[PDB]
Write a protein that binds this ligand. Structure first.
Ligand SMILES: OCc1ccnc(NC2CCCCCC2)n1
Length: 149
């Protein structure tokens, strides 16, 4: 898969993160990201995708070493960590055709896994609208503990 780049934007309290909601197969909440273009540097892709999806330009705030990266089904996703963005920031996507809504969420209230269906003696996982975000949550929490305590 083509690598994806984007951002985990946090507010000034470090207790909220900015998620975006897509449509259709992307109908749930996830961090802003997208696919890298040919010859495009990771930081430039992250800023481009984040600005397309949120209308906020991270370019001046990216730190090269501050990111969480996961490989999910052999596609790499790297989200640069951007703390300290005020919650009164006006966010507006560039394309309403891809982004339904943009909201802040409490990090402590977000799930870090989906629930099984062991009460129903059935295999698999119950739907969760944070499914896109979930893989990053525990790594984010651990990262913020290490960097800030
Ligand atoms: O959060 C990690 C992740 C994994 C898989 N898909 C996505 N898609 C995001 C960008 C596209 C438009 C809104 C939905 C979120 N995010």
């Amino acid at each position: 898969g083509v690598p994806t780049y984007g951002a985990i934007i946090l507010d000034e309290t470090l207790e909220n993160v900015l998620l975006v909601q897509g449509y259709l197969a992307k109908s749930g909440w996830g961090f802003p990201k997208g696919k890298v273009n040919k010859e495009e540097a990771p930081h430039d892709c992250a800023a481009r995708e984040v600005f397309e999806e949120t209308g906020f330009d991270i370019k001046d705030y990216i730190c090269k070493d501050d990111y969480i990266e996961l490989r999910i089904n052999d596609q790499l996703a790297r989200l640069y960590i951007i703390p300290g963005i005020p919650k009164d920031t006006k966010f507006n996507p560039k394309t309403r055709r891809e982004i339904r809504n943009i909201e802040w969420f409490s990090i402590e209230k977000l799930p870090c896994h989906r629930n099984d269906m062991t009460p129903k003696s059935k295999l698999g996982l119950a739907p969760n609208k944070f499914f896109m975000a979930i893989p990053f949550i525990r790594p984010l929490r651990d990262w913020l503990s290490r960097r800030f305590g």
